Design a protein around this nucleic acid. Structure first.
Ligand SMILES: [K+]
Ligand SMILES: [K+]
Ligand SMILES: [K+]
Ligand SMILES: [K+]
Ligand SMILES: [K+]
Ligand SMILES: [K+]
Ligand SMILES: [K+]
Ligand SMILES: [K+]
Ligand SMILES: [K+]
Ligand SMILES: [K+]
Ligand SMILES: [K+]
Ligand SMILES: [K+]
Ligand SMILES: [K+]
Ligand SMILES: [K+]
Ligand SMILES: [K+]
Ligand SMILES: [Mg+2]
Ligand SMILES: [Mg+2]
Ligand SMILES: [Mg+2]
Ligand SMILES: [Mg+2]
Ligand SMILES: [Mg+2]
Ligand SMILES: [Mg+2]
Ligand SMILES: [Mg+2]
Ligand SMILES: [Mg+2]
Ligand SMILES: [Mg+2]
Ligand SMILES: [Mg+2]
Ligand SMILES: [Mg+2]
Ligand SMILES: [Mg+2]
Ligand SMILES: [Mg+2]
Ligand SMILES: [Mg+2]
Ligand SMILES: [Mg+2]
Ligand SMILES: [Mg+2]
Ligand SMILES: [Mg+2]
Ligand SMILES: [Mg+2]
Ligand SMILES: [Mg+2]
Ligand SMILES: [Mg+2]
Ligand SMILES: [Mg+2]
Ligand SMILES: [Mg+2]
Ligand SMILES: [Mg+2]
Ligand SMILES: [Mg+2]
Ligand SMILES: [Mg+2]
Ligand SMILES: [Mg+2]
Ligand SMILES: [Mg+2]
Ligand SMILES: [Mg+2]
Ligand SMILES: [Mg+2]
Ligand SMILES: [Mg+2]
Ligand SMILES: [Mg+2]
Ligand SMILES: [Mg+2]
Ligand SMILES: [Mg+2]
Ligand SMILES: [Mg+2]
Ligand SMILES: [Mg+2]
Ligand SMILES: [Mg+2]
Ligand SMILES: [Mg+2]
Ligand SMILES: [Mg+2]
Ligand SMILES: [Mg+2]
Ligand SMILES: [Mg+2]
Ligand SMILES: [Mg+2]
Ligand SMILES: [Mg+2]
Ligand SMILES: [Mg+2]
Ligand SMILES: [Mg+2]
Ligand SMILES: [Mg+2]
Ligand SMILES: [Mg+2]
Ligand SMILES: [Mg+2]
Ligand SMILES: [Mg+2]
Ligand SMILES: [Mg+2]
Ligand SMILES: [Mg+2]
Ligand SMILES: [Mg+2]
Ligand SMILES: [Mg+2]
Lengths: 51, 204, 100, 147
RNA sequence: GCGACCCCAGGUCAGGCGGGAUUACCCGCUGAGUUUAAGCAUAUCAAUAAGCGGAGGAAAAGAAACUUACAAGGAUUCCCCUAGUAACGGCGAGCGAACCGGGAACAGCCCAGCCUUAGAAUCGGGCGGCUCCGUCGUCCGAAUUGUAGUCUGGAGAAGCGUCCUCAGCGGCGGACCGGGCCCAAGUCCCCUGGAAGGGGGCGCCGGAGAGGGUGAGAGCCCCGUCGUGCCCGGACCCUGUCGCACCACGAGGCGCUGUCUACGAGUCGGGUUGUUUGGGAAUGCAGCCCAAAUCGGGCGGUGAAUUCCGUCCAAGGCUAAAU
RNA sequence: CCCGUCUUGAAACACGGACCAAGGAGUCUGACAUGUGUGCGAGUCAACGGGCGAGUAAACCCGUAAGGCGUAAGGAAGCUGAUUGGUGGGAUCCCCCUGAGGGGUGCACCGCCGACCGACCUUGAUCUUCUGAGAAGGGUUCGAGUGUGAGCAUACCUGUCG
RNA sequence: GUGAAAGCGUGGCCUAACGAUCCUUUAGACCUUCGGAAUUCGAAGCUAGAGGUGUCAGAAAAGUUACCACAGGGAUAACU
């Protein structure tokens, strides 16, 4: 038979976050990369990194 | 239908699902148009990639008459004032519009200067290699004969800076609101006043 | 058609600008034909004559029923503008016919 | 987001939250705006007064550009001047800045609020209210008309 | 009776053209109801499905009888916006465009009519030759009830002088599209196992750690993958360069000139009927009736007369791109 | 006493169900609304498109008088267009005093009453181009108004509708 | 209006005696609009009434079926 509520191509796949929020997220990510505790917490092995 | 809500007016009673226009090809369309422009630029080299020169025209209606934009082509009167025959203009990158009228001197003069500026920085290669004819350049076909990308005579706004004037007693006594009301009143009574004046002549 | 006063309201309102007459155009003489065309149409009128309803119009004009002649013309041609132009044409034909 | 939809919380509860008595039938009150005058009368009158009927004159082929008339109030007029020009205004009291509102996409000047104290301004606009003109004049300014 | 022309007939006469198929998109016609309105007839579903035709890689549309009322825009198409707006609607249910503005693309043109009359200057066919998508010669036809030139309203004809512009092919290369060929590094030692492609150890390639195959998780066993190099072909378009040729008679451009200055009819328009449209004293279309004009005609979203003003030039035709 | 179900009432002499496996039903989308999270804020939004770019359907950049919504309302319309708060309670803080105390402070919110803009009505010294201007002065009228902005984008639940 | 006057009178001594949208029609305002600019007809608006919906919060509406159909109802008849 036919499935319930057949999936359609015109589902709303994409999302447009405001540009300023996207810039906010990038800045936070850049700042977090300079914190060794956060870099280690994410699973990176930076035990021998000079700085 | 229940509760306090705006009255719905969804136009979804036809077979709309058969007329849905998706935009999943939007990135592909951008790619194809960029490829077309890139291919076109090489075909017309060294002619500028911006295309033909367009005139400056005012926006239409009261809402947009304060701005200017690119029009279709220079009018025949503008071309004649600039001394460019209409049959030669399209062959040297000048758009021609035989329909456009010229109701004012300011509009005519603005585009005439635009044509003269364009001719100043226009290099024309000879039709045949060796012999050089009228209108062609000499020794400039190699110096600065490069394809210009982007606009070369942009049509842009030039907003004037705030000017500080001296307030005279004449301006302080001017009644702006009174002027507007009087002008409005004279406009909507123009027909009636002209009627009685004509009727007075018949009696007299 | 005076120059604009520079005010946004009132008679002759609008932005101040130096108005100039539009350049002459070939289409300005639209509706005018050559002398030959007038000659050809005049000759064909002699050969063809007048239509039955045109004969009715001129008969009314002979008896002085100008008002009825126009109404007949409007019913036939359709518009008042064409009807009164047609009536004047019939009057011109009759005016120079009675003088011969 | 499917996992947050409350239907998931209702799995195994038979009626899906629509009741055993009333049930969830197709259109038990008609579709859309059906029965606005008959069985949804109270709803329309209580929340949508004025819905039914006709008022006013028609306007065939009404174009909105003819009616374009953006307005700016007195209190907002000073904010149009650039900051560098504001300093000049306070540096020389002999002259006054010329604020042409049309250059900022405004046609008419209304008279809400007050102007900066001790600062004459020459306002250039297509239209102006009488209160706006009075406030400009009493502050030492003047009004110029354009189009 | 013999001839010319006219109309028509026959021909297995010489040489051509047409039918049918396909369905995604495209063009024309025809045309419902379920349904919604909590009933139902106008309406809505829908100018849709079904039905009948016709095309192409696109089709259709297209160089204003336009938008507008502004300081004015300027073929068509398409996107955003205009806007769920003006409007339409048992003014109920519902329905619903357009201009401005911002962008994609961009391209303009050909005829009909007065104008060779010291020359039908035009075209087809048969036959022959050549440098063969054509061209030349010759013959027989078409055509004066008009072929070719000139002209298309943006103009133009004619006269005058400024003395500005205009005449081909070939060689090579690039660009474009398609294909073919070679080219990195372990299968080293131990253990388990039917099999190592697994674990441990020791190495290597990497502009190649995409993917697949091979007896289990394989960059280095195999095909490939990355990046060069080499070779072959298709388009004849675009473009660079070289060689040869390069008659301005004529035509065009520019300037002036008294004068001339031709533009589509049972069509426009009107009445009426039906249908359709957001179009409302009537948006388009169609039938029937009436039936134009040339200092004129159409449009200017309320019918009518009167005075102005703005605007364009229908009733013939072709045309790439954005979709 | 047999589960499921409609029911005032089911163990019912009400209906479905012999048994097992697997499949099997509030979803997607448009509009709007309240709430909440986030960004910015009298602004906000990179949305058509362009510039590019992980050799790239992503990400990044671009709004120059673009546009949407908001920034001003009332009126059928012609049109006109906010003179810019008083008071009773009240959070917090400050001082005195150590009381169910007394002063100063008075945000948010609520009640009450003016003023201002507009429809309607009313009013008119003094001027004017004769129909407009407006000194003063209004109203048991009406408004989805004003009296120092709160919106815009976005995510999701719930609800109405197609 | 009435009474000398206080006062009374916004229909009937009090408790019933009546009617939306759209459309039409009338009355009123030297009123507004017909959107290129005017004049006069015509038309369209604003304010208050009238023409009616008695199923009276207001669709425009005759039968038959023993030839019958479907969704249901033990919310409801014809047995125990
Ligand atoms: K698409
Ligand atoms: K529920
Ligand atoms: K031949
Ligand atoms: K492998
Ligand atoms: K012609
Ligand atoms: K019609
Ligand atoms: K005309
Ligand atoms: K049940
Ligand atoms: K039961
Ligand atoms: K049972
Ligand atoms: K709600
Ligand atoms: K904005
Ligand atoms: K931009
Ligand atoms: K009103
Ligand atoms: K009833
Ligand atoms: Mg449907
Ligand atoms: Mg443009
Ligand atoms: Mg429960
Ligand atoms: Mg249930
Ligand atoms: Mg229910
Ligand atoms: Mg539902
Ligand atoms: Mg044969
Ligand atoms: Mg129904
Ligand atoms: Mg139903
Ligand atoms: Mg039915
Ligand atoms: Mg079909
Ligand atoms: Mg076919
Ligand atoms: Mg084909
Ligand atoms: Mg294409
Ligand atoms: Mg075509
Ligand atoms: Mg033309
Ligand atoms: Mg156009
Ligand atoms: Mg909107
Ligand atoms: Mg429709
Ligand atoms: Mg369009
Ligand atoms: Mg446009
Ligand atoms: Mg000829
Ligand atoms: Mg010539
Ligand atoms: Mg000539
Ligand atoms: Mg190893
Ligand atoms: Mg195995
Ligand atoms: Mg290998
Ligand atoms: Mg390669
Ligand atoms: Mg024509
Ligand atoms: Mg007709
Ligand atoms: Mg039809
Ligand atoms: Mg065509
Ligand atoms: Mg029971
Ligand atoms: Mg039970
Ligand atoms: Mg029992
Ligand atoms: Mg049952
Ligand atoms: Mg059973
Ligand atoms: Mg299962
Ligand atoms: Mg929110
Ligand atoms: Mg804007
Ligand atoms: Mg008013
Ligand atoms: Mg007031
Ligand atoms: Mg008395
Ligand atoms: Mg009574
Ligand atoms: Mg009595
Ligand atoms: Mg009484
Ligand atoms: Mg009544
Ligand atoms: Mg009425
Ligand atoms: Mg009009
Ligand atoms: Mg009732
Ligand atoms: Mg029956
Ligand atoms: Mg019972």
């Amino acid at each position: 038979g036919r499935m319930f509520a057949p999936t359609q191509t015109w589902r709303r796949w994409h999302r447009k976050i405001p540009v300023n929020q996207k810039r906010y997220a990038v800045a936070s990510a850049i700042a977090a990369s300079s914190v060794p505790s956060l870099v280690l917490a994410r699973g990176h092995r930076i035990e021998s990194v000079p700085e | 239908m229940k509760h306090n809500n705006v009255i719905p007016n969804g136009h979804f009673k036809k077979h709309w699902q058969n007329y849905v226009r998706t935009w999943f090809n939007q990135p592909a369309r951008k790619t194809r148009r960029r490829a077309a422009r890139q291919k076109k630029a090489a075909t017309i080299f060294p002619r500028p990639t911006a295309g033909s020169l367009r005139p400056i025209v005012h926006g239409q209606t009261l809402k947009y008459n304060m701005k200017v934009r690119a029009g279709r082509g220079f009018s025949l009167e503008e071309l004649k004032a600039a001394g460019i025959p209409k049959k030669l203009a399209p062959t040297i990158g000048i758009a021609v519009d035989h329909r456009r009228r010229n109701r004012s001197l300011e509009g005519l003069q603005t585009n005439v200067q635009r044509l003269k500026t364009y001719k100043a920085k226009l290099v024309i290669f000879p039709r045949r290699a060796k012999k050089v004819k009228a209108g062609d350049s000499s020794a400039e076909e190699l110096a600065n004969a490069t394809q210009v990308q982007g606009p070369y005579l942009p049509i842009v706004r030039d907003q004037p800076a705030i000017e500080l004037v001296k307030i005279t007693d004449e301006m302080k006594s001017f009644k702006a609101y009174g002027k507007l009301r009087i002008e409005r009143t004279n406009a909507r009574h123009f027909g009636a006043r002209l009627k009685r004046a004509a009727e007075a002549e018949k009696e007299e | 058609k005076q120059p604009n006063t520079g005010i946004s309201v009132g008679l002759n309102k609008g932005h101040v600008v130096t108005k100039k007459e539009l350049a002459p155009r070939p289409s300005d003489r639209k509706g005018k034909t050559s002398k030959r065309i007038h000659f050809v149409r005049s000759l064909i009128r002699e050969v063809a004559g007048f239509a039955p309803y045109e004969k009715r119009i001129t008969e009314l004009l002979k008896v002085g029923k100008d008002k009825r002649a126009l109404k007949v013309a409007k019913r036939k041609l359709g518009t008042h503008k064409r009807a009164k132009k047609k009536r004047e044409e019939m009057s011109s034909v009759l005016r120079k016919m009675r003088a011969t | 987001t499917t996992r947050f939809k409350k239907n998931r919380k209702k799995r195994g509860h038979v009626s899906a939250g629509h009741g055993r008595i009333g049930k969830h039938r197709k259109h038990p009150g008609g579709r859309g705006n059906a029965g606005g005058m008959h069985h949804h009368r109270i709803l329309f009158d209580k929340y949508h007064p004025g819905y039914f009927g006709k008022v006013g004159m028609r306007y065939f082929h009404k174009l909105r550009n003819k009616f374009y008339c953006p307005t700016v109030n007195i209190d907002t007029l000073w904010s149009l001047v650039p900051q560098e020009v504001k300093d000049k205004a306070a540096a020389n009291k002999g002259t006054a800045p010329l604020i042409d509102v049309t250059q900022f996409g405004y046609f008419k000047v209304l008279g809400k609020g007050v102007l900066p104290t001790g600062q004459p301004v020459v306002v250039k606009a297509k239209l102006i209210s009488k209160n706006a003109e009075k406030k400009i004049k009493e502050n030492g300014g003047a009004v110029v008309l354009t189009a």
